[PDB]
Amino acid sequence: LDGKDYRPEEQAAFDLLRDGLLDGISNRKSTPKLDVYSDQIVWGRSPVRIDMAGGWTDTPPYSLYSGGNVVNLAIELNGQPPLQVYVKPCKDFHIVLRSIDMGAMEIVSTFDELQDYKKIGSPFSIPKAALSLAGFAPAFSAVSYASLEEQLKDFGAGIEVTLLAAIPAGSGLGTSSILASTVLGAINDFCGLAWDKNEICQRTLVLEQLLTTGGGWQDQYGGVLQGVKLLQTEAGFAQSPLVRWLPDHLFTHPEYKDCHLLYYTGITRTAKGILAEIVSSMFLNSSLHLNLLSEMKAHALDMNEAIQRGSFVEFGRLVGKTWEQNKALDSGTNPPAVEAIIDLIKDYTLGYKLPGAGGGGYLYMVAKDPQAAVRIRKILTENAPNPRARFVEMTLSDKGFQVSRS
Amino acid sequence: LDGKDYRPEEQAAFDLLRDGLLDGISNRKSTPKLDVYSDQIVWGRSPVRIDMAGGWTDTPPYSLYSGGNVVNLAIELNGQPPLQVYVKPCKDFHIVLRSIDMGAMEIVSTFDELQDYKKIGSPFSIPKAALSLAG
Amino acid sequence: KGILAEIVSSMFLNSSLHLNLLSEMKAHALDMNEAIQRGSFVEFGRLVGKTWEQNKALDSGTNPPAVEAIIDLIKDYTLGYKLPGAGGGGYLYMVAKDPQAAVRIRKILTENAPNPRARFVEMTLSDKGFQVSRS
Amino acid sequence: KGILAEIVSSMFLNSSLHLNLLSEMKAHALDMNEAIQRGSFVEFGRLVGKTWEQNKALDSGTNPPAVEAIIDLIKDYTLGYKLPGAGGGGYLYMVAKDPQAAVRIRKILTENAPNPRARFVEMTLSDKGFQVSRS
């Protein structure tokens, strides 16, 4: 702020931010995973959150510490859930990361460090951290990933792991985070180490630190679990329960006073390079941010009580409120083409939001009832770039985990 | 059967068997496929038959000609259907066949013939023929 | 399968009582569809076991006696079965009365369990089966 | 029920430790909803058996020992239960681990079967519940 070494000031803050989140978890372990066994294929899969309310009450700096609460949902695009991961043993001691919609391959055994790469943002980056199980142990070495695999699996793979996302990371749906978590669930099945959903997400957040994205963290509990989150509570250092539930049930038995909400991209994301800055600029330093943050939390409890009674009409109010509560608030980045899609309609009947990020991606919005379908006719009518302008639903459908079949 | 050139006899029968089935279809065409478009991913999927009855009444030689009948079913293992195929555009003018449970890759643009390979029975062999649109 | 499709294509209308048995496989298929077209589930099961007989004892007698040990027990509880498709490996299915069926699952649960595992797998009729191109 | 609603309305805030126990019934209800609001199904079962205790041993101690013979066996396999609503007749429900539950169905299937029959009846959550005026 004075003048001098902002980049080093950012570096000092960044390293301290990491060190702040470097605390701290069991173990980091040493475990020789075994399970698979050979012939199998382990396939995981996961639905995708949105956050109705309870917005950036996530994302350290929270309140600071403590906590937040988000209550979000965890839902599904038409089929498949998507975000689905395949992982297999092989013959050839080089851990291949293999992607689709981008992926040629990532031939890996070096580690080099491990894995941990914000180095080249081939989202193969995310499976790197998926090898951060610990990902160390006795008494192996760099060549002796030979030992790692070929006593672990033992199953002489150099494991080849093959994800799939359906949607780009310009979703504002936390898809990166969810994806990583799902991989970790597949590992937990895969060759061993026997974990929990929650501690899956714990260790996920732990590596999400070194993933160095701002930890949009609501999602990784959200989209894995089912239609609630709720209660981010402790947030130091950073402690993370947060659980309990809610009926949906007015997202199903369906309303049918519409019987819901659904999608418009016509807009790509910017993507996000200023947003998580304004988050982590700052902590309990500044400003009325901290203020507005606090009643986001309040409005989240508002939310859950509301639909915990079933006030669907007021559910819609609180949705539009959250929209207001971020659009006009932090962060005022929603780019006026979005507002043209808001413009028409705003009308017919009620409110909306951008989930998650904002500044691209896609909304959803609730109406009365079949005037809703006439809104589908409205976006059907105009405002249709080739980022298409759909009904996409959403489709609450959820548990979301894995198979290891057969 | 007499003695002599069973392998050539099998070869003659094999080529005649092919030539018998070489007949014959529209077109083989020329079509410039376009659709995709770019950003998309096309994912296919399929359930798996069994045949309750109506066994090898399939499989030329049938009766010979004609016909058979099988009536079988078309069913599904628990989920996914399985047998599911993803296919995508890219940047890099080499048709990659990519498999899973075996597949490293098959980098292809040669054709060489086309595709058509009973050459190495990497079941990438099957997508070769999948490029036989005509091809 | 390296002998099976040989015995198929050895031969055409050359030989033998194959051609004979082939013909009533077709007949038995029409038998099948009429049967379950009326809903004679019990007789559906008969015709399944018949098809098994109609290929096991018939072309092709390749079903390897470990399969027959899995047949051996049970054969019993209640009714028949087949290997779909190829035979000589892979996996069967079989129909019973009703929950004695689940006790058969307990039977294969009990023994006869190599690491090619010995499951309920279902099957699960569920079907259309095509593609998405989403979105 | 001719004594039960008496003990209810004998009395109001007159007497006794009734009023006491009543109050933590309310407390235990908030216990309940928070419990399954988190999904602690195992603890859901605990609180069910607690409510049973909280009325059986408590107001009202009317549950007639034949009921307790149906409790007797089982109590076991695995977890608790209650009589809904009144008590002193009618019918329970009870939760177990998992298919040991079905073996409990085998247990009540085995014995303890007067002609007020001894069933699985389910229950079956299914609900909105109103009217038609059709058409």
Author numbering:
A (entry chain A): 544 to 949
B (entry chain C): 544 to 678
C (entry chain C), D (entry chain D): 815 to 949
Quote the passages of the study that discuss this structure, keeping the authors' original sentences:
FKP can convert l-fucose into GDP-fucose via a fucose-1-phosphate (Fuc-1-P) intermediate, and has been applied to the chemical synthesis of fucose-containing glycans and glycoconjugates. Each monomer is composed of an N-terminal GDP-fucose pyrophosphorylase domain, a C-terminal fucokinase domain and a linker in between.
We overexpressed and purified the full-length wild type FKP from Bacteroides fragilis 9343. In the end, we got a cyro-EM structure of the full-length FKP at 4.0 Å resolution with a C1 symmetry. Two interfaces are identified in the structure, with one interface formed by a six-stranded β sheet interaction and the other by a loop-helix interaction. The GDP-fucose pyrophosphorylase domain contains a typical Rossmann fold and a left-handed β-helix fold. The fucokinase domain of FKP, as predicted, adopts a GHMP sugar kinase fold. G76A, R80A, G88A and K89A mutants almost completely lose their GDP-fucose pyrophosphorylase activities. For the glycine-rich motifs, result shows that the T602A, G757A and G902A mutants have greatly reduced fucokinase activities, while mutants with R592A, D594A, G597A, G598A, D601A, G758A, G759A, Q761A, D762A, G899A and G901A, respectively, retain hardly any fucokinase activities. This suggests that this large pocket surrounded by the highly conserved residues is a potential substrate-binding site in the fucokinase domain of FKP.
